[PDB]
UniProtKB/Swiss-Prot annotation:
Tissues with expression: Primarily expressed in lung and placenta.
Residues that, per the record, bind 3',5'-cyclic AMP 2: G90, E91, K92, A93, R100, T101, Y135
Linked pathology: Aortic aneurysm, familial thoracic 8: A disease characterized by permanent dilation of the thoracic aorta usually due to degenerative changes in the aortic wall. It is primarily associated with a characteristic histologic appearance known as 'medial necrosis' or 'Erdheim cystic medial necrosis' in which there is degeneration and fragmentation of elastic fibers, loss of smooth muscle cells, and an accumulation of basophilic ground substance.
Keywords attached to this entry: Acetylation, Allosteric enzyme, Aortic aneurysm, ATP-binding, cGMP, cGMP-binding, Coiled coil, Cytoplasm, Disease variant, Disulfide bond, Kinase, Nucleotide-binding, Phosphoprotein, Serine/threonine-protein kinase, Transferase
GO molecular function: ATP binding; calcium channel regulator activity; cGMP binding; cGMP-dependent protein kinase activity; identical protein binding; mitogen-activated protein kinase p38 binding; protein kinase activity; protein serine kinase activity
Domains: entry comment: Composed of an N-terminal leucine-zipper domain followed by an autoinhibitory domain, which mediate homodimer formation and inhibit kinase activity, respectively. Next, two cGMP-binding domains are followed by the catalytic domain at the C-terminus. Binding of cGMP to cGMP-binding domains results in a conformational change that activates kinase activity by removing the autoinhibitory domain from the catalytic cleft leaving the catalytic domain free to phosphorylate downstream substrates.
Species of origin: Homo sapiens
Protein name (record): cGMP-dependent protein kinase 1
Highest taxon in the source lineage: Eukaryota
Family membership: Belongs to the protein kinase superfamily. AGC Ser/Thr protein kinase family. cGMP subfamily.
Positions that bind 3',5'-cyclic GMP 2: R81, G90, E91, K92, A93, R100, T101, Y135
Main location: cytoplasm
């Protein structure tokens, strides 16, 4: 019904789609939703620059982005992938000290839902022992499996 309920619910649903947040307790997902900030970019704007010491995670709510990597100052930047509504990027910056390994460039008008590492860590830090362990274990598993595939 209300603007706020619809938006809070929409934000929770975006967060619940991100596989690692998926099993977090309902209350933490609600509070995470209340942390999200709407941010806007124009076509061709670097949302993230490769090499930046980043601290923010992004969910795309409008538009699309192209992810690229500089491999050499001479060849074309390497096109990695294009992402759209419901996709996300930059999640490694929540886990601790991080350095962006790729550019994320707006391919048209883009809106993202943004959370920073400090806000995130404070909420994760509030999990009980069992919940915190489950979250940490999920991170360790995903980390291993992404590596072991290659």
């Amino acid at each position: 019904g209300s603007t706020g309920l619809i938006k809070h619910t929409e934000y929770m649903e975006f967060l619940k789609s991100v596989p690692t947040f998926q099993s977090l307790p309902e209350e933490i997902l609600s509070k995470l939703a209340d942390v999200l900030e709407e941010t806007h970019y124009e076509n061709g704007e670097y949302i993230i620059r490769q090499g930046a010491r980043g601290d923010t995670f992004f969910i795309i709510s409008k538009g699309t982005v192209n992810v690229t990597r500089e491999d050499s100052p001479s060849e074309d930047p390497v096109f990695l992938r294009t992402l759209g509504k419901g996709d996300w990027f930059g999640e490694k910056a929540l886990q601790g000290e991080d350095v962006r390994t790729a550019n994320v460039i707006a391919a048209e008008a883009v809106t993202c839902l943004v959370i920073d590492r400090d806000s995130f860590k404070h909420l994760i830090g509030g999990l009980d022992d069992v919940s915190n362990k489950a979250y940490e274990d999920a991170e360790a598993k995903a980390k291993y499996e992404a590596e072991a595939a290659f």
